Amino acid sequence: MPMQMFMQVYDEIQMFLLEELELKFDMDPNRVRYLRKMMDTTCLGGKYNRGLTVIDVAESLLSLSGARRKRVLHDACVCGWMIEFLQAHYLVEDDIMDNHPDVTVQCAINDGLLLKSWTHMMAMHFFADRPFLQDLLCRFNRVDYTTAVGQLYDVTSMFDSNDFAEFTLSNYKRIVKYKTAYYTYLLPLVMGLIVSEALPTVDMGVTEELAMLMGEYFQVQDDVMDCFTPPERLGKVGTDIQDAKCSWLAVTFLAKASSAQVAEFKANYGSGDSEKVATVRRLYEEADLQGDYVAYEAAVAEQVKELIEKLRLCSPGFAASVETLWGKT
Amino acid sequence: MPMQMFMQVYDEIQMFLLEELELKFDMDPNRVRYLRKMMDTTCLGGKYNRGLTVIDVAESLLSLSGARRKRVLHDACVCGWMIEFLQAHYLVEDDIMDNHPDVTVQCAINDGLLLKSWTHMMAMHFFADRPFLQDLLCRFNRVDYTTAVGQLYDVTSMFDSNDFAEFTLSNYKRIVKYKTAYYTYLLPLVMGLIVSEALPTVDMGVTEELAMLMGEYFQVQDDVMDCFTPPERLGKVGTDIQDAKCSWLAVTFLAKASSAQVAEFKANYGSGDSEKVATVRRLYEEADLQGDYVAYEAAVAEQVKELIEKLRLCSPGFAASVETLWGKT
Numbered sequence: 217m218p219m220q221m222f223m224q225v226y227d228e229i230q231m232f233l234l235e236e237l238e239l240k241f242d243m244d245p246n247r248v249r250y251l252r253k254m255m256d257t258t259c260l261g262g263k264y265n266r267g268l269t270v271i272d273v274a275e276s277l278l279s280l281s282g283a284r285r286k287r288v289l290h291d292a293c294v295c296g297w298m299i300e301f302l303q304a305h306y307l308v309e310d311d312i313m314d315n316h317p318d319v320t321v322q323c324a325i326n327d328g329l330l331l332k333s334w335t336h337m338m339a340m341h342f343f344a345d346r347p348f349l350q351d352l353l354c355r356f357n358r359v360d361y362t363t364a365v366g367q368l369y370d371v372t373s374m375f376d377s378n379d380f381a382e383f384t385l386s387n388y389k390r391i392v393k394y395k396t397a398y399y400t401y402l403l404p405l406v407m408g409l410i411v412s413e414a415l416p417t418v419d420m421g422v423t424e425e426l427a428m429l430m431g432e433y434f435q436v437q438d439d440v441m442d443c444f445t446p447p448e449r450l451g452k453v454g455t456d457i458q459d460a461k462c463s464w465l466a467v468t469f470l471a472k473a474s475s476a477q478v479a480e481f482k483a484n485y486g487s488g489d490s491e492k493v494a495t496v497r498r499l500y501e502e503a504d505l506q507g508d509y510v511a512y513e514a515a516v517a518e519q520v521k522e523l524i525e526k527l528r529l530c531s532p533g534f535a536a537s538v539e540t541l542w543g544k545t
Numbered sequence: 546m547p548m549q550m551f552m553q554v555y556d557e558i559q560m561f562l563l564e565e566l567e568l569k570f571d572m573d574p575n576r577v578r579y580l581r582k583m584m585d586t587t588c589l590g591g592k593y594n595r596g597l598t599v600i601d602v603a604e605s606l607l608s609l610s611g612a613r614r615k616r617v618l619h620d621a622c623v624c625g626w627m628i629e630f631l632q633a634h635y636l637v638e639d640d641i642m643d644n645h646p647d648v649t650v651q652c653a654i655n656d657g658l659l660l661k662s663w664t665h666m667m668a669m670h671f672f673a674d675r676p677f678l679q680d681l682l683c684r685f686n687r688v689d690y691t692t693a694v695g696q697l698y699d700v701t702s703m704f705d706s707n708d709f710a711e712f713t714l715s716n717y718k719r720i721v722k723y724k725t726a727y728y729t730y731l732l733p734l735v736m737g738l739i740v741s742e743a744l745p746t747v748d749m750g751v752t753e754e755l756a757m758l759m760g761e762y763f764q765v766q767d768d769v770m771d772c773f774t775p776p777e778r779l780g781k782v783g784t785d786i787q788d789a790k791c792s793w794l795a796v797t798f799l800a801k802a803s804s805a806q807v808a809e810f811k812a813n814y815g816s817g818d819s820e821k822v823a824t825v826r827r828l829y830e831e832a833d834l835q836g837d838y839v840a841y842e843a844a845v846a847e848q849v850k851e852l853i854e855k856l857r858l859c860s861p862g863f864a865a866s867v868e869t870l871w872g873k874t
């Protein structure tokens with residue numbers, strides 16, 4: 217039912233957007249079909265955890281506060297696709313960064329703009345008569361801004377914006393929080409509260425704290441898998457070492473490395489050479505980082521498992537969806 | 546006074562945005578100064594015609610409907626900078642299209658996202674208590690969407706989105722209308738009406754028609770200058786022929802060329818070779834396109850000079866600013 221309903225609303229949203237282009241923006245059929253394929257390629261095929269989380273928050277709140285049921289759930293589905301389209305937008309922007317005018321790059325830039333604009337167009341249409349439309353747009357735009365700021369923190373973590381000084385745990389958490397947690401964990405919860413009209417009924421402090429912690433938990437595991445999970449099992453080629461990323465492994469290693477090891481880490485980090493990357497993996501191994509990884513996640517899990525309880529003391533139904541969200545993590 | 550006030554509000558807007566980053570987004574000084582320089586580099590130095598047009602529309606309407614004066618004019622200045630920041634955003638995106646992770650491209654993509662997000666942040670702050678905030682955001686987002694659609698029309702005018710068939714005058718006007726006229730001509734007028742509270746008092750049909758015509762007038766001259774005005778006088782190297790652009794010259798030539806000339810045009814268009822570009826300029830000359838250019842602009846000017854009168858029959862003060870805007874064109 218959840219996934220089936222999410223996909224039906226995708227067809228409805230897509231058909232509105234494409235007909236709007238045909239009927240109001242003078243678009244020719246060849247380009248409409250081109251954009252339908254681009255939308256399908258970039259928005260479909262993931263796990264939809266961000267979008268389905270909006271649905272789950274919405275259904276948990278209509279069970280603990282007929283016609284309002286159907287409207288809120290449909291609104292939850294449109295909000296889920298807003299976040300999924302926003303995610304598709306970030307992925308396209310990421311692909312440009314590592315990919316006679318080159319029309320494929322021109323079309324990639326254009327795709328990224330269209331995907332973001334479509335979040336606005338689908339909200340303005342489907343929520344035109346909702347009282348929360350203005351607050352919805354503002355919180356959505358603020359989270360999107362936050363994500364772009366987090367991307368700046370991430371991309372410049374090894375230089376001086378006109379260098380391992382910013383390789384600290386607090387900066388690592390700043391990157392995770394702004395670059396990932398806000399739009400991936402906080403935003404689905406907030407939107408589920410907005411369409412459920414129950415926004416001012418929750419402790420947003422605990423809610424923000426949980427979203428940040430859950431993003432941190434997921435990103436630490438992601439960082440360790442990027443380095444140790446082999447590509448055919450990870451689903452991609454891990455490249456954090458080559459890319460000099462401010463990863464959990466890097467910042468944890470630098471806190472417990474010896475002076476000559478840090479020299480060896482610094483001499484080998486951020487290189488595509490197979491032996492230097494292997495040297496970094498070797499250093500991580502010797503420092504027992506995969507052992508510290510288990511303890512770190514355990515401590516985070518304890519903070520999460522205990523923070524949902526504060527939340528449920530005044531917002532019981534909200535906590536069950538946050539628990540399901542955390543369970544997926 | 547107009548330019549002086551526009552620049553003072555720039556400092557106010559910039560200081561709000563940078564302090565917000567420092568105070569609410571955990572940004573370090575090095576990055577704040579980096580973003581201040583980027584903002585200055587990308588947003589300042591133009592002619593500010595889009596932004597000042599908002600101011601001019603606002604002052605013309607408070608003279609023909611003390612405290613409301615100062616508030617509306619300040620709102621007009623924030624709106625002007627919204628459009629100027631949006632323009633800076635499009636220019637950055639354009640530069641990426643024709644410009645080991647490459648951090649300059651990463652930072653260019655990031656700049657483009659920040660510049661767009663800043664239009665939302667400055668609106669949400671300075672208009673937080675305005676009744677028009679929701680309508681303002683929606684019309685702004687719709688024009689931005691329109692511009693991205695026009696960019697798609699422009700970039701794909703020579704191919705089949707998975708070719709001179711789309712080299713027609715009606716498609717040329719579709720490109721100009723969506724890619725330029727809406728955000729450059731229509732949007733400043735609309736925003737000036739919104740902050741002046743006089744939006745539902747104007748004939749939006751005539752207003753849209755004027756904005757489209759004025760964009761067309763300006764783009765036709767731009768197209769002819771791109772081909773014939775030498776670089777040190779044009780301010781850039783004209784490259785429409787090399788880039789196979791659907792320009793006014795191209796579509797006008799194809800309507801009056803002979804079969805063997807179209808073969809010669811088709812064989813030489815869209816090439817960087819100096820002789821093929823010169824062959825295209827030669828063909829344009831022989832067809833007396835610079836003579837037809839004068840007549841075309843004259844006819845457009847007549848439609849403009851006569852459409853402002855319909856506008857002033859019910860919206861007199863609005864027409865004087867539209868006249869000043871047209872005068873700049």
Ligand SMILES: CSc1ncccc1C(=O)N(C)C
Binds near residue numbers: 263266401541543
């Ligand atoms: C638990 S996985 C998840 N849960 C909620 C939203 C998004 C995700 C996700 O797919 N990533 C990669 C974080």
Ligand SMILES: CSc1ncccc1C(=O)N(C)C
Binds near residue numbers: 730
């Ligand atoms: C008349 S020039 C102008 N007027 C109003 C808004 C923008 C402009 C402009 O600079 N271009 C390049 C169109």
